[PDB]
């Protein structure tokens, strides 16, 4: 079970806030000369901690007014929950997909411009789809936290 | 005004956040200069509100993923104080207001069910704007990823 | 209470679709001469069977995409329900209110243009009323048939 | 489209309410001479915003005192959906039918006499219907607020 | 014990009367191949055993234009003296025949019996939801009465 | 039709169903052959369906009251045959096809949770029509009375 | 049937299992030779079923304890072929038919999510017969014992 | 902590199913010597592996013939969940009782000789404790399994 020190722990909390640094910049924010702090970002990136750098957006600036969390029940046929996999990891506006232990088979998290474009998604894809047995749905009324940074104070 | 180019830039900068601008340009096939512009612009208008290391869970010992269904107080300052205190929580990733049964959906992120239990019964469900609360936890991830779909715009 | 017969409920059927018809149009098609057929509709209104006559709008026409149900449950106090109903009654969003016998204790139809106009009213307006316990609310995926005309046929 | 302004919005609240209205009644509420009145309702009904005029009608006076509201679960086949769609349009007791978001797949509203005719509909037509897998409904105790008037003043 | 007291003959003439309540002695005796003398004693310890209860009417609904029958589930409020208030009111109103206390997650189940939707929505509205003990209720309908029997089965006893 | 007299009558016996004409007469103020002559109509018009001596459940060991809701099996018949199964069921008393989720609601008696069981399991669950049953106890009687309430009459 | 002292000796035996006949009636008041007479007729009666030495689940790495409610499908010998399959499932200590809208609910333990994904993904959902299944797990234990009341028979 | 070897595993295993087994009978059950044996199992009682030895019992062979599963519903006040442990810890018919993760706040496991008895203690004794909100039962038809014994091949 995975053990960091104080540093190593700084150096990924710098780098979940803000993933495009310099080796300067981290440097900086984590109090350490830039060699040294190189020479830990390595190890930590050799480990497979940092699995991607990504941009985020602002769903609101591309026109996504409408986020949708969407309990799909899957048909309790053969290779339905298979088949569902690979259909949902073929639909661009569904971002993520659990398997869950509750009453939900499946949670979907997805964006849509409106409810007009939601619906199309629902009735022609979602529903639609062979192993796929009920689906009902909420959406983000406000959004209150919305961070990918883990939590790490665990490790030290 | 986001065309072809813009959108391009965007979806590229979504899958690698850490891309050289000689590479980038070359992706969404511009110049150099022109290509730095345009990116510069996308994020002074916060159309790129962040660029994030996304780390794996497994990898830190994060092995228990919990959705909370939060049901708040029915009273004054309950919602407020709530979400000040969810934003101090650094288990708890994301958390929403939505429009079900549900009042606010959270995300978050344990090593075990202990640790998970010592959050829910020491901080969630004593906090005072905390009605009820009962969780899921993820069996099996079958997707994940932050990039927004931006077909719609083109 | 009036007796309706054949040609009252005739009438009723024909304006129940066409409610524009001037007395002239009305009289060709129910077998009443006009002077008969303009006294027997205001009859038919004096009695309040006719309640009103109504321009129906499309509401994606005028940028109402998002159509709401929202079940709401009241809170038990003093003057919760009429207080509500006080309330509901002056906001022009919603257009349905109905106490009902399940599980929800009123039903509203509500229209709005898009999730963040409907969030603004849940979060500033509904559940901020003090009546209210907690709402849910349902979407429109798909108008599948919508008509303001009441079945006659029984009174036949 | 067209672009709607104060006036054109008036004679829409207007006539949502006054269906029935004359021109030069319309004309003289609206503050416009009744020549570009009769234009201007003209292309509001050509636009489709206008869709239909309808005489509304007490239930209560037509013997319709039973107001259902029918949650409907479809059965997961093929032509389910659009088989279920197509005789609810050909169903005069149901006003409306709408697919919904959540796990109601149609919310129905329909009147009946009482009881025992919403029992002969419920138990002989729709649990009948080989592309329905389930109902359960609720009936109304109270209207608070029945209006078909559509929120307009968003325009402005 | 019961299957101690009542014999063969007892579970008979119990059979008999919960079908046809108003038989008399020399009917009942008559149905049970007994004499009414000893037919009489049997029948006594019976209703002094507490064993039948009640003789009653039962009435058509319909006939009587009793058109809406209702089973209301009932939450009750948890405060001091909610559960006895509400059982002592439910026992004053007419139109519930019967309320149980029951084991899943409705507190209380009601029975009760109304001419149309309006007089529901009455009762509901204006009595059982103002109720200071009721925090709930919620409603179904009868759309097909399938069996309706007071009679209960004495097979057991044999 | 039926006015105050006629409701006093129906009111009375649904009482006491072994009540004689002459106290009959006495509680409803008439004399004994008017009397008569009217509780014959009323029974004539099919207003009185039924008397009955109503049991003590506990008497007779029948200690275990069940309100049972049953989900009928989507298909053709197996309405009919789950009806015509239920009506010859002795313990089961009352059925009714219901307007909620429910769809058909079985009121039933038994001994104990042992004898319940035995018929859940193996006559119940068992049934082709029935595609499945979840069940309530009581744990108190607070009414129960067969009279109908007639004051709406007047 | 059972004395005063038979349910003593019972008592002491549900807390104390391994107890030393001498040690056992010094505990009941009794010499050791009737003492060990009336442990043998309960013994023989089927009264106490079993000894079992009782572990701690955290002791021994299994620090998730699921209750896992399975809708079993609806077709011939599904029930039967689901309760033989649990018999051998190790990591179900108790599973019952019940009355309400469970079907079965199944006491499970495991070392932690994953594991406890692998046996429902893998093992539990993948049988024919079973339709659903949603879980729940512990938070805290706030009572855990085996000993059954016995002051009713006093 | 002690660290288990197969040998370790062994007499836990052995000891799970007959708890009364002596030092003699064990040690041949696990192929040890008497004294080795010995020692052994004092250091996992020690360690508190073995938390307790038991006789079981047969509900029925004791007129408990009624087994419930009882989901409670705690007051949302700081003092409920204290004072409701500390009751229920001194109320024998409960054998166990579990805070959850999901919507049943506790889940208590309690045997009854019937439902009269049942019926006592949750009006009388369980429904009327200021700390429990509500409560809801199951009962159990049918056992399919019940053991004390944990699996451990996990530590193999
Ligand atoms: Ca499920
Ligand atoms: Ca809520
Ligand atoms: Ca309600
Ligand atoms: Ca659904
Ligand atoms: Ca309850
Ligand atoms: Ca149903
Ligand atoms: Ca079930
Ligand atoms: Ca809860
Ligand atoms: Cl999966
Ligand atoms: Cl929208
Ligand atoms: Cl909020
Ligand atoms: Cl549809
Ligand atoms: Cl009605
Ligand atoms: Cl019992
Ligand atoms: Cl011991
Ligand atoms: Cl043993
Ligand atoms: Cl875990
Ligand atoms: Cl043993």
């Known amino acids: 079970q995975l053990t960091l020190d104080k540093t190593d722990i700084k150096i990924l909390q710098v ?6 640094l310099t080796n300067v910049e981290l440097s900086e924010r984590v109090a350490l000369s830039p060699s040294p702090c190189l020479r830990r970002l390595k190890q930590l990136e050799d480990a497979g901690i940092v699995r991607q750098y990504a941009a985020l957006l602002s769903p609101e600036s591309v026109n ?3 986020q949708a969390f969407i ?4 048909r309790k046929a053969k290779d339905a929950r298979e088949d569902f996999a690979a259909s949902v990891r ?3 506006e569904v971002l993520s997909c659990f398997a869950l232990t ?9 964006f849509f ?17 062979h192993g796929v047995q009920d689906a009902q749905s909420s959406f983000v009324l406000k959004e209150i936290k919305h961070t990918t940074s ?5 490790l030290l």
Chains 1, 3, 4, 8 share one sequence.
């Open 102 to 110: 509750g009453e939900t088979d499946y949670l979907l998290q997805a």
């Open 15 to 20: 780098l979940q806030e803000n993933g495009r």
């Open 64 to 66: 996504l007014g409408l």
């Open 113 to 129: 411009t409106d409810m007009n474009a939601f619906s199309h998604f629902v009735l022609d894809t979602l529903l639609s789809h």
């Open 90 to 92: 073929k639909w661009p």
């Open 150 to 154: 883990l939590p790490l104070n665990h």
């Open 71 to 74: 309990r799909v029940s899957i």
